[PDB]
Structure 1
Amino acid sequence: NARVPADLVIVGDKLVFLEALERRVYQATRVAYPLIGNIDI
């Protein structure tokens, strides 16, 4: 097992990773980042 720089947050009573991965991946590459979905009304 190895050490890794990542932020961890505690919500409710559980410990969860909180990732906003846009610089490590999807940066300067011609792919669109998901989680920017559209809705129709």
Structure 2
Amino acid sequence: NARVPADLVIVGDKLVFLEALERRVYQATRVAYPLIGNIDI
């Protein structure tokens, strides 16, 4: 194993990661980030 700096939160009774990976990946490249999706009304 390795010790890796990444923040962990706890919700309800479950321990989950919480990643907002925008700086390591999808930065300084020409791809559109997912989770920026569109809706129609």
Deviation of the 1:9 alpha carbon: 0.1
Alignment RMSD, CA only? 0.3
Q: Report the TM-score when normalising by structure 2.
A: 0.98
CA distance in 2, matches of 1:3, 1:32: 31
**TM-score (norm: length of structure 1):** 0.98
Offset of residue 16 of structure 1: 0.1
State the number of aligned residues: 41
Identity of paired residues, percent? 100
Q: CA deviation at 1:3?
A: 0.5
